[PDB]
Structure formats: C-alpha cells, structure tokens
Amino acid sequence: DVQMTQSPASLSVSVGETVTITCRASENIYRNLAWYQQKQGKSPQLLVYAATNLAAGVPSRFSGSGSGTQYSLKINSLQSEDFGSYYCQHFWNIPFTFGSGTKLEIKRADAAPTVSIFPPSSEQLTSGGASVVCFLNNFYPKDINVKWKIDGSERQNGVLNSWTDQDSKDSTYSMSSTLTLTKDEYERHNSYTCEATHKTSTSPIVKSFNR
Amino acid sequence: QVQLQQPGAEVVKPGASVRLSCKASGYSFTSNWINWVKQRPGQGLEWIGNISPGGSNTNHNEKFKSKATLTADTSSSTAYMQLSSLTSDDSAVYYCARYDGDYGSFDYWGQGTTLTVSSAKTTAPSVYPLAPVCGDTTGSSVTLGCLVKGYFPEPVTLTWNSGSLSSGVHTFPAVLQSDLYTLSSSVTVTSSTWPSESITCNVAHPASSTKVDKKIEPR
C-alpha cells in the first residue's frame, strides 16, 4: 500500500497570488493521482486527474504536474472562490488513500480580539446551573487560547470551546468559551476571569467580574 | 444528470448498526464502482472501500474490514454501507462517490450523510440571555449574547430581532458534550443602540418544534 504526504497543511494567501500544493507518494505511482477541492460544508469536487489533466469545466488557472513520486497542484492567480481545502488521492493500488489536505485561508491585517465576559443569567441560576461565557471576537490570525480563573486559580474542568470559520465580511476569527459550574459552586466564589492569549497579546487580555 | 442520493443525517445509538444508502441515477448502475469515504469534523478524507454493483465484488481499507459491510441492490440502483458496533469514533460525514475508469478517479459525489452516534433523546434547548457585566458602557459599542443549552439533535436556528439584526453577529458551532448540544451567539451594536432599543434572541429547534425568544435585559 501507498502513503501520501501532502504539503503545506495550511497557507494564508491573497486573491491574485499563485499557490503550489505538493503531494509525495511512498512509491512510484505512475501519474495515477487526482486532486479535489472541498469548499466549507460541501462535498469534494474533482479538479485534476491522471496527475496533469483538467476535469471537465474546471477553470484553466488550475494545473497539475508531476510523475514518479512527486506531484503538484498549482493555482495561477487565485480567485475568491478558491479558498477552501484541497486533497490529493492516489489510485495505484488498494487502498486509494488521500493526502491529509491543504487549507487555504484569506490573508488580512492582524487584529487583537475583543474580549467580553458574561455572568450566569438569573434564569439559569433558578434552574440550578451556572455558566460563565467569554467571547473572544474578530481577531486575526487564527490561533488563540483562553484561560479561566476562579478567585485567581486556573480552572480547566467544565470548559467548552467553539470557534467560527473565517468571517465572510471581515476575514477575522472568533471564539466562544463557556465555563459551566453548579449554582452552588458558582455562589461560593467571588471573582471570575477570562484571559485571551493571541499573537497581538502574548501577555493576555484579561476580563473579570465579581459575583 | 448523474446524481448520487444520500440521506442528510442519521442519529443512531451506540452499539447498534446502521445501513447508509446511496441511490444512483442518470447512468447504468452496474457500469461504475461506488466508493465510500469517511470525514470526521475538521479532519481529512479517509477511503473506506468500494463495490462493483452486479457481481458485488468489493475492496476494503483494512481499518474498516469489520466496521463496514458493502452491498448493492441493482433493482433499486442503491449501494449500501452497513456500519456495525457503533461508537463515538463512527460519528462523521460519510460520502458515496462514483469512480470513472476514464478519469481514474471520483467524478460524482453524494451530499454526504452526517452520522451522529448518541444515546440522547430529542430535547428542546434552554435559552439564556447574556447581558454585560453591570460595569459600564463608556466603550463605543456593546456586546450581548445568547446561550442555547441542552438540546438534541442538531440543528438550531438563531436570529437576533427576528433577523432584523444580522450585522455584527457571531453564531458559534454547536458542541456536543455529555450527550447534549450547547451553542452560543454574540451580537455587537453601538452603545447608543442598547439598552435604549430592544434586542432579543430567537431560537428555533425544529426537531422539538420549539421557538423561544429571550430579550436581553440590563442586569
């Protein structure tokens, strides 16, 4: 069987630029290689087959090349519709393995997160629960980390996090983090803190309240 | 005109088995291999196996040899993948795809079936308003939120002011933990807007046929 090594895993790019994605097979696969594009929330779609041939109706800015163990997909003057993920796949023998993927992301200016913290609602407390929520909004680049503290002590348990995809209007990222406690635990403590660490703030942006 | 029809979603219990379907149209069903592909959330594509309808000859990724059983009904032009002994690691999107001998690759794909393996029963969400800390709005803007907790299955549809307020919104992907979903949404407006004007979160959960409004009130 054949292992495929795809590179890069991710790249930030701008419309108009030229991008090259690479796949490397563990043995000679004699041009039995396809490339697919996969847009967010959509099924993959064939771009290139037999290493070098454009599928029916695929834009000419896409090109495939290679032979032996080394294959490339090139996008010449990238357009808005080209952001998403790309995968190679071989058909040399069973199993027909895919490369691990390349995600293309839109470049924009760096932006510090806007951090907001929210105490539990009266409603939730009446039901006996206590969720504290922290939004870390409209930041760039993508990587970020949040730390919770209760009365100055770091809290790891009971934390749920979620992240948006790149924003359709401003190309930033956002994150939501929820710390969930029992109402009894919540009411024993005094201060609640959310700390955001980002490229723009390696010393964290800190938001707190007193219950 | 070539189409592969898959169910959009299936919820199934752990330890149970599920039969996923792929109904082909627009070509002679026995002419092409049907392949199956797994994709875990935010991860890559993984090839499971294939079948040649008619003789029903098959190939498998060794990793799926017991997990997946591939069959086909030529009288209904439908390929089937049985997934047995279900666990949380089976929760994924499963695509069927047609192989073309000319292209030497997959030329048409189904929409994918989102398989959720869970013990949960259908459950309406609790919706909580998130008002800012009673600190102070000397900032030029203000961020409000809505917390949607404890529902099953997906999806929910969340709007702000019945959809009147669409700019400055971040609605986060749901997270399944301890076998219920939670999601959240933030909305950011200028400080002159709130609390002078009403802002309400509206949350529809079609599986339980519920719709719930929560007005965000100052603390």
How would you label B132-159 residue by residue, b for 16+ Cβ within 10 Å and e otherwise?
A: beeeeeeeeebbbbbbbbebbbbebebb
Across the strands, what pairs with B46? B38
B182 Cα to chain A: minimum distance (Å)? 9
**Same structural domain, A96 and A1:** yes
Q: What is the DSSP letter of B8?
A: S
Which of A61, A89, A108 is the last residue in one of the domains? A108
Indicate which of B147, B166, B187 best probes the interface with A, i.e. most A CBs within 10 Å of its own CB: B147
Which of A91, A108, A125 is the last residue in one of the domains? A108
**Same structural domain, A191 and A115:** yes
**Same structural domain, A95 and A145:** no
Structural domains counted in chain A: 2
**Same structural domain, A77 and A20:** yes
**Same structural domain, A100 and A148:** no
Chain A residues 166-205 with a CB less than 8 Å from chain B: 167, 174-176, 178
Chain A residues 99-118 with a CB less than 8 Å from chain B: 99-101, 114, 116-118
**Same structural domain, A56 and A155:** no
**Same structural domain, A151 and A62:** no
Check residue B59 and give left, alpha or beta (phi > 0: left; psi -120 to 50: alpha). beta
CA closest to B106 among chain A residues: A46
Amino acid identity of residue B199, one-letter, is: I
The helix (H) or strand (E) run that includes residue A54 is strand A53-54
Whether A99 contacts A160, CB under 8 Å: no
**Same structural domain, A151 and A90:** no
Q: List, in order of start, the domains of chain B with CATH numbers.
A: 1-119 (2.60.40.10), 120-219 (2.60.40.10)
Resolution of the deposited coordinates, in angstroms?
1.6
**Same structural domain, A53 and A141:** no
Method used to obtain the model = X-ray
Q: Which domain holds residue A200?
A: 109-211
**Structure token pair of residue B114:** 């989102």
Extended beta strands in chain B, E state: 3-5, 9-12, 18-25, 34-39, 45-52, 57-60, 68-73, 78-83, 92-100, 105-109, 113-117, 126-130, 141-151, 157-160, 169-171, 175-177, 180-190, 200-205, 210-215
> Measured on CA atoms in the order A138, A139, A142, A146, is the torsion positive or negative?
negative
Closest by CA to A68, choosing from A28, A27, A21, A33, is A28
**What is the CATH classification number for the domain harbouring A9?**
2.60.40.10
**Same structural domain, A118 and A99:** no
Which of A93, A108, A123 is the last residue in one of the domains? A108
